Amino acid sequence: PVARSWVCRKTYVTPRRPFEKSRLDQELKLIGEYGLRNKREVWRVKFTLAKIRKAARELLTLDE
Amino acid sequence: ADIQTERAYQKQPTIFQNKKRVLLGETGKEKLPRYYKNIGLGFKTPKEAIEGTYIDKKCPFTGNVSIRGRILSGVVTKMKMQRTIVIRRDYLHYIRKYNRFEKRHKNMSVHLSPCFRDVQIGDIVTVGECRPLSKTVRFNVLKVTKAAGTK
Amino acid sequence: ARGPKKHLKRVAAPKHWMLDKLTGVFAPRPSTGPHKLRECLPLIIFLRNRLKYALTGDEVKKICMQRFIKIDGKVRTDITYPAGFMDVISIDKTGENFRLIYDTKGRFAVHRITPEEAKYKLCKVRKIFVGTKGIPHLVTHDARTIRYPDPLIKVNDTIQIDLETGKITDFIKFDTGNLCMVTGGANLGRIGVITNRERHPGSFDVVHVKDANGNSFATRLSNIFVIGKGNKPWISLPRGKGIRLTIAEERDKRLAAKQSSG
Amino acid sequence: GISRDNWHKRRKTGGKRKPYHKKRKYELGRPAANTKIGPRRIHTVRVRGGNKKYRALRLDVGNFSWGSECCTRKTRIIDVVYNASNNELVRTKTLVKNCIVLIDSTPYRQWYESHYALPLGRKKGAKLTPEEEEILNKKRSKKIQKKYDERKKNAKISSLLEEQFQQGKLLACIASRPGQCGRADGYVLEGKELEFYLRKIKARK
RNA sequence: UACCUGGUUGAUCCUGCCAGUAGCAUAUGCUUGUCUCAAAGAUUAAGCCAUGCAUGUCUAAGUACGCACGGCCGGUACAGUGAAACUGCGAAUGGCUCAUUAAAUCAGUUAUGGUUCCUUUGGUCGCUCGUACUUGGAUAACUGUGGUAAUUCUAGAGCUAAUACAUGCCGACGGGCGCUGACCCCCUUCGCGGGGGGGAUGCGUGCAUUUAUCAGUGGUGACUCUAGAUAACCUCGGGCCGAUCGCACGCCGGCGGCGACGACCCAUUCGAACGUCUGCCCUAUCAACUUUCGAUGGUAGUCGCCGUGCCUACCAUGGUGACCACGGGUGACGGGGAAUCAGGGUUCGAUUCCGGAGAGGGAGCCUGAGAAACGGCUACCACAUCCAAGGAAGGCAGCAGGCGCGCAAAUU
RNA sequence: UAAAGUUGCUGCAGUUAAAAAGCUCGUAGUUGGAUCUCUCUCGGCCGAAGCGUUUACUUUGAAAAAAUUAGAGUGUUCAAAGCAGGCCGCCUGGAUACCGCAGCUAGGAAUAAUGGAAUAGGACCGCGGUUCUAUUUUGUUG
RNA sequence: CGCUACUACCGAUUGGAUGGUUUAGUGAGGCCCUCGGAUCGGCCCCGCCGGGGUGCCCUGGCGGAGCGCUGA
């Protein structure tokens, strides 16, 4: 037993198709336009928006 | 009839039958009041329990058994034991993957008090939970409902 | 395990203690006493986590061993002493009295009471029995035994105990129309008038309760603690009067309070 | 050092069971107190919770009650005559609960004579021993004499008990457990219970 | 993000698998600047372990004649601090690990009206009609004499304590109650058929225990509950009814305040134990199993903390099974949970929380409220340490650490 | 693990690609046609007012550890986190949802199963009828 | 069929090494029981000095050489 917490979470998701020209171009455009270090920053913001959309969708299935 | 069938004397432990009574003051038999109790939960004491002569220490009504816990029901399946019957409880168990049910059953050995005379195979019995009465018996028959086809 | 357990893991502690997760591995295991382990607030949690009078368990011990803390009128030096519902905590050095009273969230509020109110406490009678050559005895939720109670007092009633002498001075019957708090379950900490008691022989009676705002809930009979005759409590209630606001009304009240400042 | 667990037994289906732990102390059992008849000998047993059990190894005296007369007396136990569980317990003269024993009738005879002013179990040829005709007759006033006369109307004793009192020993059932409390208490057999046990004893011998 | 792509043919459309694709978890390779969290000898070997440490503990309040320190030279027993030792309490918690274990454990649900419960908290504690202004003998520590190669081995001798171990009383206490019954009074009929009383000697009284009987204070859905009454029992291995310690001080020989400690008993708390209902992986190349080597039920008992074939003796012939019994396997502790996932599912869960189990393998116990305890004991089995060869001493699946094992895991 | 609708309950196949037993009977299993729209305490607004054959189902309500998950609040400098914090002593948090199955509870009555009388051993009821309650309405078995 | 390599299978090579299961016999050690009684201690006898009790030997200090009881 320790007084430590192991609640940790990955903040991004790797794309299913590694070498897809359209997605590579879109991500590089975002990186260059916003001065991002790598593709993981794009994937992190994408993951944030994806979780928000999932929550909104699950709320939209409930009664008004 | 012949209550004393065992090697030891059979009597209700709470009834004193050796009180001194003069001969000329006899009306019927000298003295043998019958011990019985009303179990709770709205169950009616069978008339055979009140006016019977059987000695059963595991009887819910005239014995030393307190009914507490679960009240269950079953159909009488076998009656080949002394003061004990085997009932069958049928139920449906839900398997979630297939969203369906399966028939399962459990056999339960319950004590049958001799107050329920004329109990057949296939009629419903309401049993109540008591302390362990033997290795496998933990329920006492409290009510007997006859089968639908029984005339 | 062999014999009794002596430790309590911090994460297995009752959630209403509002202990965090990174302070330590252990929570203060309440000592045996008047109240159950999960229905009590140890003295250390009260004097350190709620009142902030101490920063550590060592300082809680330092306070307790100066005999400054009274629980139900008696000085207690056990820092894990189980203080529970209705218990009166008196700190005469700082001149403050508290009564351990549930919040609408199910937590023991820091509820300060007047020194006149600190003279008595309500107790729900757990059982009535005759013993010792016809002497009637009464046992409360506080686990105190009282000989020669009033013949009208029955189980589930509420008595008023004068802490100085510890004898019954008044009692409320368990009747429909009497104010009551809930001391367990989902509705823990809610205050309302008893509407009806549905009886289930051989099982748990259910008591229905209606809030002062008209909200109706239900609990088991073992979770009902009669507080006052009619709708008037015999004790002081916390800032929330036992009315459990929904999360929407809590949000609205918080937003209104925040927007009123600045 | 025997055990008392239920998991060493076959299941209801008759299948074999696998022990998942070794014997626990609370499942323990102890050797039987084969309580003989003899000069008193009791060994105290320390039991669970720190309490005491009184393992009677020898008992010559018990406390037996004449239920109809409500006359409880301390009495020497003479013999074991019937055992519904095992006939061997009779052969070894073991005192257990519900075993039928012979007890001295002298205390109950003394109470009966001092209460009813009536002889009991006394041979007609004899003319009483010295220093007991007084307690039988005494010098009583009119009130005491009429009290005993009123008692005399309910002094009839059943013939079976009367014959036992003639023989000097009564049949009794031990109602306590000597191996757990160290005592052989019980009640004198009477009525249909006495009839049943006399029939059983005479069928056995 | 509810997704596909390459590969059979000369070419085509398919079935279909192989390969690709993304996560996840172990290992490994190459590389590695900052900073915050953070797993870490589970997998193979519940294999073996050098060494060290991991459980001890004193308040005003059990026992202080250790000058070991220390004063106020005395009808001044004990100033005080205090090693040691006796006494008490804990050592049954925690930590580790997952070998066993397939309705077993476990989970939810109920029950104990079928049990035990140190401690805490509250109550009860002159409720007993029968040396006290304080009783007895020891033993430690200490002094002194020793033995063995060897140990947390201990043996003689000389003292001396108790909240250790024993014994045991004034008092409340005046008597009441019950059952006895030498005797006396009054009235009615001098058929006392009847009554009413006072009563001296005697026995027994409270709580607890055991048995039998009686009557119907409160309570339950339901007692053979609680309470009451009677007749007695009342364990030599004999139960309660205080021979205890500190502080503050008093009051015209008595009466006391505040505590500490202890003892029944009853509640309470913390539990434990044992039952209820439902739910567990694969396997039929496992279809019948169990049956007094108790198997299922009955009666009586024994034992047990208690319910119970728990065991025993008689009696009956039962009980489970294709709704999969029984048997077998599990690189099976169960669960909360984890990974992945459109919906549905699939796989995992040794692993910090809960429950279980174990301490090299079995078995058996002592003490205690609680252990079938292993940082307790006894024995056997395996391994193993010292030896002067006579004996003695063992248990890291605790924390580090070592060996071994391995693909695989950190600081004595 | 997804991709694998290559284990298919959702949701796959069986003419020739792998595949329907040679053919019937047949028990268990599975599945089965229409049909049926008082209150034996009553007192001058209050309660002894009934799972009223039953179950499945559905909708409730209790009760159900925490942590994890979801999720509310909160500028950890951001974030993973944490359960903190905020304002010039005071103020405010430490929510909430979910928690299969089984068990308990209460409404609904479609769907599904089940039951009620045909040998009348039938429902409501006026009239009878052969043991027997230990409360009798106030000087106690006078 | 001939080669070469690999893999299961059959099988008395009357093969070598551990793992278990079990009739028969033996059985450590603990616990219980029935005995046992090395020792130790109390009350009367070669303990007899001493007390609020005077020649009441009777103790609260020493084998009181005791088929005398008694407890451990």
Side-chain angles (χ1 to χ4, degrees):
Chain A
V2 283
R4 316 200 252 250
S5 152
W6 317 299
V7 186
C8 73
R9 155 175 326 210
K10 176 187 279 318
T11 52
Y12 66 102
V13 153
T14 299
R16 163 113 48 94
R17 291 197 207 244
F19 309 117
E20 190 215 308
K21 260 270 199 53
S22 46
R23 181 185 46 72
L24 296 165
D25 302 353
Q26 267 150 24
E27 264 134 25
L28 185 55
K29 274 184 220 109
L30 292 168
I31 285 168
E33 164 176 16
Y34 289 97
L36 307 185
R37 182 167 96 251
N38 47 3
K39 301 258 167 157
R40 215 199 282 120
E41 301 199 324
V42 194
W43 300 343
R44 156 175 77 202
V45 184
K46 197 191 262 58
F47 195 51
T48 286
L49 164 71
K51 297 219 278 316
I52 289 174
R53 286 186 35 101
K54 199 223 191 139
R57 256 193 100 221
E58 193 258 326
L59 285 171
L60 287 166
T61 49
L62 301 182
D63 188 12
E64 194 130 14
Chain B
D2 191 33
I3 288 327
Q4 316 298 328
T5 42
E6 322 289 338
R7 298 185 47 171
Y9 192 65
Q10 298 292 307
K11 57 164 204 108
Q12 308 185 278
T14 42
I15 286 302
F16 181 55
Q17 38 194 258
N18 291 336
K19 188 197 216 341
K20 266 183 46 162
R21 292 203 66 228
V22 73
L23 302 180
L24 196 57
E26 272 183 87
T27 37
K29 65 206 150 58
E30 193 189 75
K31 192 86 84 178
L32 198 53
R34 164 81 159 192
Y35 167 79
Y36 71 94
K37 59 166 156 188
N38 97 92
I39 71 165
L41 315 177
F43 286 98
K44 153 173 218 44
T45 329
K47 198 198 91 83
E48 215 303 337
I50 314 199
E51 61 118 29
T53 56
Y54 65 92
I55 296 307
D56 187 29
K57 63 173 201 249
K58 282 151 187 175
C59 175
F61 307 95
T62 83
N64 196 17
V65 157
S66 118
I67 300 295
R68 73 285 176 292
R70 303 189 179 280
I71 308 289
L72 310 184
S73 287
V75 309
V76 183
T77 274
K78 274 178 300 174
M79 319 195 26
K80 310 248 76 177
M81 281 183 314
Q82 282 176 350
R83 303 197 154 146
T84 327
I85 58 170
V86 175
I87 71 176
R88 176 196 197 95
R89 312 190 59 224
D90 300 326
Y91 56 103
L92 291 167
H93 176 237
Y94 184 67
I95 312 284
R96 199 201 308 132
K97 169 184 190 182
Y98 304 102
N99 279 121
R100 266 153 187 118
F101 298 85
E102 60 184 35
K103 277 184 176 54
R104 306 169 152 226
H105 82 274
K106 298 228 186 175
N107 273 12
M108 169 190 296
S109 291
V110 300
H111 178 86
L112 184 61
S113 174
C115 65
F116 302 104
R117 297 200 81 124
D118 297 319
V119 157
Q120 299 309 310
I121 275 186
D123 39 340
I124 323 295
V125 279
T126 303
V127 302
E129 203 206 310
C130 51
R131 65 173 152 81
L133 301 182
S134 58
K135 186 178 190 288
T136 66
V137 173
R138 289 99 162 81
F139 284 82
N140 251 306
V141 176
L142 313 187
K143 223 168 64 167
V144 178
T145 274
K146 251 70 218 174
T150 51
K151 182 172 301 175
Chain C
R2 322 169 262 151
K5 282 175 159 11
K6 314 240 211 160
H7 297 73
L8 190 57
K9 289 307 177 54
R10 200 168 192 83
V11 81
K15 198 218 204 318
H16 76 272
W17 294 356
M18 298 184 292
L19 298 180
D20 74 341
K21 83 174 46 184
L22 291 206
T23 309
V25 161
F26 294 99
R29 170 102 183 197
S31 296
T32 44
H35 304 274
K36 284 178 162 292
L37 195 141
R38 332 267 317 164
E39 309 170 4
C40 74
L41 192 75
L43 208 43
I44 168 160
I45 306 303
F46 187 67
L47 291 176
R48 188 195 42 193
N49 298 25
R50 301 291 96 95
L51 295 183
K52 317 305 214 301
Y53 274 123
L55 301 200
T56 45
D58 229 293
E59 283 172 22
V60 174
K61 176 257 328 188
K62 279 171 178 315
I63 288 166
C64 280
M65 297 285 334
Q66 299 188 79
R67 313 186 60 80
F68 288 157
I69 305 299
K70 270 189 200 102
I71 305 196
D72 275 344
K74 322 238 163 291
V75 159
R76 307 284 176 200
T77 48
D78 192 24
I79 65 152
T80 45
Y81 179 89
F85 189 58
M86 281 306 168
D87 271 20
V88 174
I89 296 151
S90 275
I91 328 174
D92 300 329
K93 200 82 196 295
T94 47
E96 40 194 347
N97 303 275
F98 314 83
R99 176 178 313 271
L100 272 206
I101 286 292
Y102 285 117
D103 259 0
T104 6
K105 258 111 181 194
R107 281 126 35 170
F108 274 127
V110 179
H111 173 51
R112 309 181 137 85
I113 64 185
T114 64
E116 304 74 59
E117 160 145 3
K119 281 174 187 87
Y120 65 84
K121 73 171 298 190
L122 303 189
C123 306
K124 165 179 191 176
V125 22
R126 282 270 161 78
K127 74 217 275 167
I128 303 269
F129 67 97
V130 181
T132 320
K133 57 213 47 175
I135 294 170
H137 290 69
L138 167 153
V139 186
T140 75
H141 84 292
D142 175 0
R144 45 175 85 223
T145 297
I146 288 143
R147 299 189 324 164
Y148 303 117
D150 192 290
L152 287 174
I153 306 183
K154 304 295 170 194
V155 168
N156 302 119
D157 294 350
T158 285
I159 69 188
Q160 197 191 285
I161 282 302
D162 158 86
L163 294 182
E164 163 83 329
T165 63
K167 40 206 46 193
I168 306 168
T169 69
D170 215 349
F171 70 95
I172 315 136
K173 294 282 313 206
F174 187 93
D175 270 337
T176 273
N178 278 342
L179 197 69
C180 81
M181 209 202 247
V182 180
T183 56
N187 306 305
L188 165 52
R190 294 178 88 174
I191 296 159
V193 156
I194 298 156
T195 287
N196 91 101
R197 162 200 187 150
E198 30 170 311
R199 313 173 154 262
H200 305 273
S203 196
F204 311 96
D205 285 3
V206 191
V207 173
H208 293 245
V209 184
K210 193 207 262 153
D211 268 347
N213 282 172
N215 310 99
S216 182
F217 48 100
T219 88
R220 283 176 178 185
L221 172 60
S222 63
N223 297 330
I224 296 292
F225 197 115
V226 179
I227 294 315
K229 169 84 163 266
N231 72 101
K232 330 134 73 174
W234 287 16
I235 45 126
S236 312
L237 307 181
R239 43 161 56 270
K241 248 58 198 181
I243 324 289
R244 187 192 263 164
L245 321 177
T246 76
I247 42 186
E249 335 179 344
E250 262 164 76
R251 177 238 297 138
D252 286 348
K253 155 174 154 263
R254 164 176 66 84
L255 288 202
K258 283 180 185 169
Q259 290 332 285
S260 293
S261 318
Chain D
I2 74 100
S3 189
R4 279 193 96 241
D5 42 278
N6 313 293
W7 46 256
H8 82 258
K9 292 268 287 196
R10 282 181 174 283
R11 340 205 195 78
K12 181 196 197 176
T13 66
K16 193 184 47 92
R17 170 143 30 199
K18 279 223 188 71
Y20 77 105
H21 61 224
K22 49 212 49 192
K23 289 183 203 189
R24 294 271 180 276
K25 154 92 173 217
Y26 58 79
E27 311 156 356
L28 104 161
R30 299 194 190 94
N34 313 117
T35 314
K36 260 59 209 195
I37 294 179
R40 185 239 281 299
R41 157 173 298 170
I42 303 150
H43 287 182
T44 285
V45 187
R46 203 274 196 185
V47 309
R48 174 168 202 84
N51 313 107
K52 314 258 255 194
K53 262 180 198 164
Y54 302 102
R55 177 120 307 142
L57 305 177
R58 307 216 190 119
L59 289 161
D60 55 348
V61 158
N63 188 47
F64 294 86
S65 170
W66 198 354
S68 40
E69 331 283 338
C70 327
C71 161
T72 321
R73 289 290 175 271
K74 199 170 65 58
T75 302
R76 146 163 151 272
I77 301 172
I78 302 175
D79 212 6
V80 184
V81 293
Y82 184 73
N83 214 287
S85 313
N86 200 359
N87 273 307
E88 163 97 319
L89 302 173
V90 176
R91 177 185 133 293
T92 36
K93 279 107 172 77
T94 294
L95 303 178
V96 297
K97 184 160 122 59
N98 210 48
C99 91
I100 308 305
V101 287
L102 286 164
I103 61 170
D104 166 14
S105 52
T106 313
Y108 323 88
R109 195 264 284 289
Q110 187 260 130
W111 171 86
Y112 187 99
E113 281 177 344
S114 161
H115 178 82
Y116 283 134
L118 249 285
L120 175 49
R122 287 251 189 239
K123 169 67 200 94
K124 299 302 294 286
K127 231 58 167 184
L128 307 177
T129 215
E131 302 312 302
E132 57 98 340
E133 77 282 59
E134 184 67 42
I135 192 69
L136 195 122
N137 293 279
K138 254 208 299 194
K139 298 271 187 180
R140 297 168 195 139
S141 46
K142 61 287 218 187
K143 255 172 162 193
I144 319 291
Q145 264 323 324
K146 78 142 271 293
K147 148 188 304 210
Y148 283 62
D149 291 336
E150 169 59 8
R151 281 199 213 137
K152 216 169 304 313
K153 329 269 182 43
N154 333 86
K156 197 43 213 185
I157 280 340
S158 69
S159 54
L160 301 154
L161 274 183
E162 250 161 32
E163 177 180 345
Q164 301 210 92
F165 272 98
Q166 309 288 318
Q167 309 204 42
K169 42 197 61 181
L170 290 164
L171 279 185
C173 195
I174 281 161
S176 63
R177 289 137 83 215
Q180 312 268 274
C181 71
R183 314 209 197 166
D185 292 22
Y187 59 92
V188 183
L189 290 184
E190 302 182 86
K192 273 147 213 102
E193 178 161 28
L194 181 53
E195 279 150 48
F196 170 96
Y197 282 120
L198 286 160
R199 174 193 325 142
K200 253 45 178 55
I201 288 156
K202 81 166 295 314
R204 155 80 142 70
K205 319 295 196 197

